[PDB]
Amino acid sequence: ANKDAIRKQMDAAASKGDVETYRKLKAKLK
Amino acid sequence: ALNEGQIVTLAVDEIIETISAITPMAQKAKKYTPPAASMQRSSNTIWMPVEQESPTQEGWDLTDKATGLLELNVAVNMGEPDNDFFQLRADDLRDETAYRRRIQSAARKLANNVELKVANMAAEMGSLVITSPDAIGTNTADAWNFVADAEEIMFSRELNRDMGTSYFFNPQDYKKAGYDLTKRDIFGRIPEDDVLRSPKLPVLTKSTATGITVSGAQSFKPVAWQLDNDGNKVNVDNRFATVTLSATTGMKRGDKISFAGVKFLGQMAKNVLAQDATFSVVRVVDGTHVEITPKPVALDDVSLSPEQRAYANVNTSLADAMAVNILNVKDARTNVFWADDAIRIVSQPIPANHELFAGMKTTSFSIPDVGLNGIFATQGDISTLSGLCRIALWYGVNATRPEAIGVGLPGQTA
Amino acid sequence: ALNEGQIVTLAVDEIIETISAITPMAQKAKKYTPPAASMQRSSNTIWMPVEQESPTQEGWDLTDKATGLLELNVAVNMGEPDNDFFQLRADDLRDETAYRRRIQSAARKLANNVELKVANMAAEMGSLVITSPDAIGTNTADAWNFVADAEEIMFSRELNRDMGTSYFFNPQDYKKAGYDLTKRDIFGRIPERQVAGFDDVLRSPKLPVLTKSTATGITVSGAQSFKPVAWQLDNDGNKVNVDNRFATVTLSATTGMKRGDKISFAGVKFLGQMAKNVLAQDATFSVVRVVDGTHVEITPKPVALDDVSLSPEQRAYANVNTSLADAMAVNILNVKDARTNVFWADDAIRIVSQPIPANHELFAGMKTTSFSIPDVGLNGIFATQGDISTLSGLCRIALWYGVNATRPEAIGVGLPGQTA
C-alpha cells in the first residue's frame, strides 16, 4: 500500500542526505 | 554500495535510535543546555544555580530583608568528547543492514560510556546511604524493602520536589524484589513508583578503615564566592567539605561514612530526623584529610548568619574526637536512587565547520531523548585502504545536590 | 602536467607490465582463481581440490567402472596484502617518464617480494631432498649434475608423468653448472609448447640459504601411522576437509629443529606413485613447524603401503614402504649451510588471488582503482591521496595473493656441500 511509497520517499531522503526528513518518514511508516 | 548521503542518514538514524533506546539512567537525569553556546573547544566550567533557601520572613514590614540572601552555584566540566574512532570496511557498506549493524555496535559502546559514567557518579557521589543486614526480597519478615526505605528517607529529608524519585536496581536485586517484568520493557519502563534495573550498577568495595575519628572541632558554612589568584570573584562549589581526620588509611573515593552524633534534618522544616547523617567521600587529599560530598552545615552552630543557617542539613557540627562510622562494611553491588535534579547531563553542540574542508564529511546530530549532542564524521585513509569513521558525544554529567542521590547497600552484616 | 585519469592509467599500465615481465618464478606456478568473490577483509580459507589421475578404462560397457577415488582438498589462506606505500613527489609528476619510472620502481619492489615469497615457499616446503658432499660443477669426476639427479628422482617417483619439470638455480650454482648467460636476461630466459613439455632451467637470485640443523640423536617416539582422510568433524559438529599434506609425528625431542629443516627416516623408502614399487632412494621429509618440544609436522604425509587398516582407495595414496617404527632415527639431511636449488612439477605450487574488496568513489579523500595482472595472476589495488604534510600525493599499490605449495611431494630442493 502506501507503505511502499513512503519507503521510496525514505530512500530518496536518505540518498539526498536529509536525516530529519528520513526520521520523520520512518516514524510515519511505523 | 551505499552512497555518501545514505551513509550519513543511516548512521545518524541508527546512532540516535539505539542510544535513546538503551540509556535508561541517562534519560532520568535532567537535561541542561548551557545558556552560552559558542564555537569553542575549550571546556568552560558552567555554574548552574542551586535552589535558593531563605530564612523565614514574617511580619508586615520587611526592610532590608531581601538583601543578604545566599545564591550558591555548582560547577560542571564537560571536558573532552567521547569518541568511537574506527574504520569502515567494504563488508560494512555492502548494504544497509550491515552498515546499521556496524553503526549500532559503535553507538552501543557510546551508550555504554554514558550509562557507566552516570551509574558510577551516582554510586560514588550518592550520600543518602541506606543499609540493612538483610538481603533485598519480598519476604516481609527477613528481607529488606529497598524502595520503601528509599522513599521514606527521601520524604523525611524533604529533598524531593514532590515529583517522585527514581529507583535503580541491579538485576540480582531486581529479581529478588519480585518484579514481574512481563508487562514491562527490558529495563522495566512500562512501554507504551518508576522502578528500573540497570546492568551497569557498580559494586561498592568494602572500606577497611577502623579507627577513624575527627581530628578537631570543625564547622562548615555555605560560602557564596571567593577571590581567585587574579583577584576576581569566583563562586565556591558548596557541595564538598574538606574534613580533617585522625587518619585516612583505607579510605577511598566512594566510601560512605557517618559521624557519631551528627543527624539529618528535614531540609525545609529543620526538624531532627532519626537517621544518622550519611556522607560520601569523593577524594582523599592527604593522610589526614578527606572530602565528603554533602557539606555538613549545623543548625546549632551559632557562628552562622540566618541566611547561612537556612542551608543547615545536620543536627550538630563535628566535635573534637567524634567516631566516624563506616557504612559500607561489606562488599555489595549498589542500588541507587535519586530525586529530580540530583543528576544533570550538560551538553552543547560540538563546534564544527561543515562542508568546508574537502575529504572530511562531518554531520552534526543530537539525541533529544538523552540530551546529548554529537558529530559524525567520515574520511578516507590510504594507510588503511578504508574509510575512517568517527562518532563523538560531548556531554558532562554533574551530580547536582549529592544529598539527593542515594545508594542502597544490602547485606551489610559486618 | 598529468591529470588524475592519466595518473591512474599510466600507473596501472606500468605495474602490470613490470610485474608481468619481472617474475619468472610466479609464472611457473599454476595460477588458481577462486570461484568465490568475497567482500570481506579476512579471506575465507579456499579449499581447492587436488586431483590424481584415474586409470583409463577401455571397452564399450563401462557400467562397472566405479572406483570413485578419494577426493582430497588442500587449504590456501590469503594473508594481508603486500603493499608499497610511498610519496609521489612533485619531481615524479613533472612528466610521463618520471611517473613511469617511479611506478616501475614500486612494481619492481612488489615483484621482487613476490618472487622471494615463492622461493621461500619452495625451499622451506620442498620434500625431495638430494644431497652429497660434492659441489655443483661441469666436470663429472667430482661434481653434481643437478638437472640429471632431479630428473632421475622425478622419473623414479613418477610424479611428472606428462608435463615438464621447472628447475631453478641460484646464480653461483647456475654459473658452476655450465649455463651461459650470453644472449640471456637476468633470470636466464631467452628473449623471444603450452600443451606439453616446456622443460626449462632458470636462474633465480631469490633462493634463500638453508641453515644447518643443530640436532642429533632424535628418535621417533611411539608407532605412528597416517591415513589420508577426506573429512573430519570440527568443533561445531560440521564436516570440514582435512589438509592431508601435513602429518604430525611424535619425536624424542625437537631441540635444534626449525621450519626449514629436512629429515629422512632410516627404514622408510620412497615408492613409485603409479606402481607402488619400493625405490632405493631414502624417503625424504621436510618439516613445516615444530608444534611442541615433542611433536613436529612434516610436508609429505607418510602413508605406508603395508597397512592393513588402509582402504584400497586410501592405499592409492601411498608413498612409504613401511610406517614409522618404535625407535627410528630422524637422520637429518641438511647438515651444512648452503644456498638451495629448487625444482618442482607442473602443479606443485599454486598462486591464488582474488580482487581486493574495496568500495570506490564513496570517500572523496582517496582515489582507489582496482587492477589485475592476468599473466602472473595477482589482483591488486592502486590508491592515491593528497597529503598536506608533504604538499604532494601519497600513493599505495597493494597486491593481494596467496602462495600455496600444493603437492609438496612434487617440490624438490637440492642443496650441495653436505660433507658432514
Short mmCIF file of N, CA and C in Angstrom, two decimals, chain C residues 176-274:
data_model
loop_
_atom_site.label_atom_id
_atom_site.label_comp_id
_atom_site.label_asym_id
_atom_site.label_seq_id
_atom_site.Cartn_x
_atom_site.Cartn_y
_atom_site.Cartn_z
N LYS C 176 78.23 -22.36 -12.05
CA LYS C 176 79.05 -23.57 -11.90
C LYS C 176 78.56 -24.69 -12.82
N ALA C 177 77.25 -24.81 -13.00
CA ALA C 177 76.68 -25.90 -13.78
C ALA C 177 77.01 -25.80 -15.27
N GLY C 178 77.53 -24.67 -15.73
CA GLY C 178 77.90 -24.51 -17.12
C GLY C 178 76.90 -23.78 -17.98
N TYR C 179 75.84 -23.23 -17.39
CA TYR C 179 74.85 -22.49 -18.16
C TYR C 179 75.35 -21.07 -18.41
N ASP C 180 75.42 -20.69 -19.68
CA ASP C 180 75.92 -19.38 -20.05
C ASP C 180 74.79 -18.36 -20.09
N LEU C 181 75.11 -17.12 -19.72
CA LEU C 181 74.15 -16.03 -19.71
C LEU C 181 74.20 -15.20 -20.99
N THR C 182 75.00 -15.60 -21.98
CA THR C 182 75.09 -14.84 -23.21
C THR C 182 73.75 -14.86 -23.95
N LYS C 183 73.37 -13.69 -24.46
CA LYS C 183 72.09 -13.51 -25.15
C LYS C 183 70.92 -13.92 -24.26
N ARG C 184 71.07 -13.68 -22.95
CA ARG C 184 70.07 -14.08 -21.98
C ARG C 184 69.83 -12.93 -21.01
N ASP C 185 68.63 -12.90 -20.45
CA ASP C 185 68.27 -11.86 -19.49
C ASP C 185 68.83 -12.22 -18.11
N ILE C 186 68.40 -11.50 -17.08
CA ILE C 186 68.93 -11.71 -15.74
C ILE C 186 68.57 -13.09 -15.23
N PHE C 187 67.33 -13.52 -15.48
CA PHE C 187 66.82 -14.77 -14.93
C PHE C 187 67.15 -15.99 -15.77
N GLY C 188 67.82 -15.82 -16.90
CA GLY C 188 68.15 -16.94 -17.76
C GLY C 188 67.13 -17.26 -18.83
N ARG C 189 66.04 -16.51 -18.92
CA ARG C 189 65.10 -16.70 -20.01
C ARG C 189 65.66 -16.14 -21.30
N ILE C 190 65.40 -16.83 -22.41
CA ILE C 190 65.80 -16.35 -23.73
C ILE C 190 64.80 -15.31 -24.20
N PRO C 191 65.25 -14.13 -24.62
CA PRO C 191 64.32 -13.10 -25.11
C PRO C 191 63.67 -13.54 -26.42
N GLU C 192 62.36 -13.77 -26.38
CA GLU C 192 61.63 -14.22 -27.55
C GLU C 192 60.54 -13.23 -27.93
N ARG C 193 55.88 -26.53 -25.95
CA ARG C 193 54.78 -25.59 -26.04
C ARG C 193 53.99 -25.55 -24.74
N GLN C 194 52.82 -24.91 -24.77
CA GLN C 194 51.99 -24.82 -23.58
C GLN C 194 51.28 -26.13 -23.27
N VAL C 195 51.01 -26.95 -24.30
CA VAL C 195 50.25 -28.18 -24.09
C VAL C 195 51.09 -29.20 -23.33
N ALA C 196 52.36 -29.34 -23.70
CA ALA C 196 53.21 -30.36 -23.09
C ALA C 196 54.66 -29.92 -23.15
N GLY C 197 55.49 -30.57 -22.34
CA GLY C 197 56.91 -30.30 -22.36
C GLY C 197 57.24 -29.00 -21.64
N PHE C 198 57.89 -28.09 -22.36
CA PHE C 198 58.28 -26.78 -21.83
C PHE C 198 59.15 -26.94 -20.59
N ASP C 199 60.08 -27.89 -20.63
CA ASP C 199 61.04 -28.06 -19.55
C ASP C 199 62.11 -26.98 -19.64
N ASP C 200 62.24 -26.17 -18.60
CA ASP C 200 63.16 -25.04 -18.62
C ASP C 200 64.00 -25.01 -17.35
N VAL C 201 65.23 -24.54 -17.49
CA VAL C 201 66.14 -24.32 -16.37
C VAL C 201 66.41 -22.83 -16.29
N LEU C 202 66.05 -22.22 -15.16
CA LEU C 202 66.16 -20.79 -14.97
C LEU C 202 67.03 -20.49 -13.76
N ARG C 203 67.56 -19.27 -13.72
CA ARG C 203 68.35 -18.80 -12.59
C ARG C 203 67.54 -17.76 -11.82
N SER C 204 67.38 -17.99 -10.52
CA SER C 204 66.61 -17.10 -9.66
C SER C 204 67.49 -16.66 -8.51
N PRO C 205 67.82 -15.37 -8.40
CA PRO C 205 68.68 -14.91 -7.30
C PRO C 205 67.98 -14.77 -5.96
N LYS C 206 66.72 -15.17 -5.85
CA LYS C 206 65.96 -15.05 -4.62
C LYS C 206 65.98 -16.32 -3.78
N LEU C 207 66.72 -17.33 -4.19
CA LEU C 207 66.78 -18.57 -3.42
C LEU C 207 67.47 -18.32 -2.08
N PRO C 208 66.89 -18.76 -0.97
CA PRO C 208 67.48 -18.50 0.34
C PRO C 208 68.56 -19.51 0.68
N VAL C 209 69.22 -19.26 1.81
CA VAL C 209 70.24 -20.15 2.35
C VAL C 209 69.60 -20.99 3.45
N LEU C 210 69.77 -22.31 3.36
CA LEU C 210 69.19 -23.23 4.34
C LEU C 210 70.19 -23.44 5.47
N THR C 211 69.87 -22.93 6.65
CA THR C 211 70.73 -23.11 7.81
C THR C 211 70.74 -24.58 8.23
N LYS C 212 71.91 -25.05 8.64
CA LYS C 212 72.04 -26.43 9.08
C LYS C 212 71.25 -26.67 10.36
N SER C 213 70.87 -27.93 10.57
CA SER C 213 70.11 -28.31 11.75
C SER C 213 71.07 -28.75 12.84
N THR C 214 71.01 -28.07 13.98
CA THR C 214 71.85 -28.40 15.13
C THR C 214 71.16 -29.40 16.05
N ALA C 215 70.73 -30.52 15.48
CA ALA C 215 70.01 -31.55 16.21
C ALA C 215 70.60 -32.91 15.87
N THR C 216 70.90 -33.70 16.89
CA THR C 216 71.46 -35.04 16.72
C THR C 216 70.76 -36.02 17.64
N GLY C 217 70.65 -37.26 17.18
CA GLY C 217 70.16 -38.34 18.01
C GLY C 217 68.67 -38.35 18.25
N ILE C 218 67.89 -37.56 17.52
CA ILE C 218 66.45 -37.55 17.70
C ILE C 218 65.86 -38.85 17.16
N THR C 219 65.03 -39.50 17.97
CA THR C 219 64.40 -40.76 17.60
C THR C 219 62.89 -40.62 17.63
N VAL C 220 62.22 -41.39 16.78
CA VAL C 220 60.76 -41.41 16.77
C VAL C 220 60.26 -42.03 18.06
N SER C 221 59.23 -41.42 18.64
CA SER C 221 58.59 -41.93 19.85
C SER C 221 57.25 -42.54 19.47
N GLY C 222 57.02 -43.78 19.90
CA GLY C 222 55.80 -44.47 19.56
C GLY C 222 55.83 -45.03 18.15
N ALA C 223 54.67 -45.52 17.72
CA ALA C 223 54.49 -46.09 16.39
C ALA C 223 53.38 -45.29 15.71
N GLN C 224 53.77 -44.41 14.79
CA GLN C 224 52.82 -43.54 14.11
C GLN C 224 52.43 -44.12 12.75
N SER C 225 51.13 -44.14 12.48
CA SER C 225 50.60 -44.50 11.17
C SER C 225 49.63 -43.41 10.73
N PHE C 226 49.70 -43.04 9.46
CA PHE C 226 48.90 -41.95 8.92
C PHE C 226 48.11 -42.44 7.72
N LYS C 227 46.82 -42.10 7.69
CA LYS C 227 45.94 -42.47 6.60
C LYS C 227 45.32 -41.21 6.01
N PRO C 228 45.30 -41.06 4.69
CA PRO C 228 44.66 -39.88 4.10
C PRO C 228 43.15 -39.95 4.29
N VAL C 229 42.61 -38.93 4.95
CA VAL C 229 41.18 -38.85 5.25
C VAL C 229 40.64 -37.56 4.65
N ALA C 230 39.47 -37.65 4.03
CA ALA C 230 38.92 -36.52 3.30
C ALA C 230 38.13 -35.56 4.17
N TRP C 231 37.50 -36.04 5.24
CA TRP C 231 36.64 -35.22 6.07
C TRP C 231 36.95 -35.45 7.54
N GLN C 232 36.65 -34.43 8.35
CA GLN C 232 36.67 -34.57 9.80
C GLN C 232 35.65 -33.62 10.39
N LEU C 233 35.24 -33.89 11.62
CA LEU C 233 34.29 -33.04 12.31
C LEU C 233 35.02 -31.94 13.07
N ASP C 234 34.65 -30.70 12.80
CA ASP C 234 35.19 -29.57 13.55
C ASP C 234 34.42 -29.44 14.86
N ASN C 235 34.73 -28.41 15.64
CA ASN C 235 34.12 -28.28 16.96
C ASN C 235 32.63 -27.99 16.87
N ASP C 236 32.18 -27.36 15.79
CA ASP C 236 30.75 -27.08 15.64
C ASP C 236 29.95 -28.33 15.31
N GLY C 237 30.60 -29.44 14.99
CA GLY C 237 29.92 -30.64 14.57
C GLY C 237 29.73 -30.76 13.07
N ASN C 238 30.13 -29.75 12.31
CA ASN C 238 30.05 -29.81 10.86
C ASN C 238 31.24 -30.59 10.30
N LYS C 239 31.19 -30.84 9.00
CA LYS C 239 32.26 -31.56 8.31
C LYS C 239 33.18 -30.57 7.61
N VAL C 240 34.48 -30.71 7.88
CA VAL C 240 35.49 -29.84 7.28
C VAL C 240 36.54 -30.72 6.63
N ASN C 241 37.06 -30.27 5.49
CA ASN C 241 38.10 -31.02 4.80
C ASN C 241 39.37 -31.06 5.64
N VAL C 242 40.16 -32.10 5.43
CA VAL C 242 41.41 -32.31 6.15
C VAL C 242 42.55 -32.03 5.19
N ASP C 243 43.47 -31.16 5.59
CA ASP C 243 44.67 -30.89 4.80
C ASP C 243 45.60 -32.08 4.96
N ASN C 244 45.51 -33.04 4.04
CA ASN C 244 46.29 -34.26 4.12
C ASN C 244 47.73 -34.07 3.70
N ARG C 245 48.16 -32.84 3.46
CA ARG C 245 49.57 -32.58 3.21
C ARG C 245 50.42 -32.80 4.46
N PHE C 246 50.02 -32.25 5.60
CA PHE C 246 50.84 -32.23 6.79
C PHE C 246 50.43 -33.35 7.74
N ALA C 247 51.42 -34.07 8.26
CA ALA C 247 51.21 -35.09 9.27
C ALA C 247 52.13 -34.81 10.45
N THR C 248 51.56 -34.81 11.65
CA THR C 248 52.32 -34.51 12.86
C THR C 248 52.81 -35.82 13.47
N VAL C 249 54.11 -35.88 13.76
CA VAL C 249 54.73 -37.07 14.33
C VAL C 249 55.25 -36.72 15.72
N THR C 250 55.46 -37.76 16.52
CA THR C 250 56.00 -37.62 17.87
C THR C 250 57.45 -38.06 17.86
N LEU C 251 58.33 -37.21 18.37
CA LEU C 251 59.76 -37.49 18.39
C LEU C 251 60.25 -37.45 19.83
N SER C 252 61.49 -37.91 20.03
CA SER C 252 62.10 -37.86 21.35
C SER C 252 62.27 -36.42 21.82
N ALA C 253 62.76 -35.55 20.94
CA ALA C 253 62.91 -34.14 21.26
C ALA C 253 63.01 -33.36 19.96
N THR C 254 62.59 -32.10 20.01
CA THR C 254 62.63 -31.22 18.85
C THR C 254 63.65 -30.10 18.99
N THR C 255 64.59 -30.23 19.92
CA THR C 255 65.59 -29.20 20.13
C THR C 255 66.49 -29.07 18.90
N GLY C 256 66.77 -27.83 18.51
CA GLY C 256 67.58 -27.55 17.34
C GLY C 256 66.85 -27.66 16.03
N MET C 257 65.54 -27.87 16.04
CA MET C 257 64.74 -28.02 14.83
C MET C 257 63.99 -26.72 14.54
N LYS C 258 63.88 -26.41 13.25
CA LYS C 258 63.19 -25.21 12.80
C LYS C 258 62.36 -25.56 11.58
N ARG C 259 61.78 -24.53 10.96
CA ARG C 259 60.89 -24.74 9.83
C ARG C 259 61.62 -25.31 8.62
N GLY C 260 62.82 -24.82 8.33
CA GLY C 260 63.45 -25.16 7.08
C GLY C 260 64.17 -26.49 7.01
N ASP C 261 64.19 -27.27 8.08
CA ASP C 261 65.00 -28.48 8.10
C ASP C 261 64.39 -29.58 7.24
N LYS C 262 65.22 -30.58 6.92
CA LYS C 262 64.82 -31.75 6.15
C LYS C 262 65.23 -32.99 6.93
N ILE C 263 64.36 -34.00 6.95
CA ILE C 263 64.61 -35.24 7.66
C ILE C 263 64.33 -36.41 6.73
N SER C 264 64.87 -37.57 7.08
CA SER C 264 64.71 -38.77 6.26
C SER C 264 64.84 -39.98 7.18
N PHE C 265 63.70 -40.58 7.53
CA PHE C 265 63.71 -41.74 8.41
C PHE C 265 64.48 -42.89 7.79
N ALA C 266 65.20 -43.64 8.63
CA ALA C 266 66.17 -44.61 8.14
C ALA C 266 65.49 -45.75 7.39
N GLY C 267 64.47 -46.36 7.99
CA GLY C 267 63.83 -47.52 7.41
C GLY C 267 62.76 -47.25 6.38
N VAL C 268 62.48 -45.99 6.08
CA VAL C 268 61.39 -45.63 5.18
C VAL C 268 61.96 -45.34 3.80
N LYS C 269 61.37 -45.94 2.77
CA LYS C 269 61.82 -45.80 1.40
C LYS C 269 60.70 -45.27 0.53
N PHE C 270 61.07 -44.56 -0.53
CA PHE C 270 60.08 -43.99 -1.43
C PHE C 270 59.43 -45.08 -2.28
N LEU C 271 58.26 -44.76 -2.82
CA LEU C 271 57.52 -45.64 -3.71
C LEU C 271 57.12 -44.90 -4.97
N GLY C 272 57.16 -45.60 -6.10
CA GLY C 272 56.59 -45.06 -7.31
C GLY C 272 55.11 -44.80 -7.12
N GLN C 273 54.66 -43.59 -7.46
CA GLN C 273 53.27 -43.24 -7.19
C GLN C 273 52.31 -44.10 -8.00
N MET C 274 52.64 -44.39 -9.25
CA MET C 274 51.74 -45.14 -10.11
C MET C 274 51.94 -46.64 -10.03
#
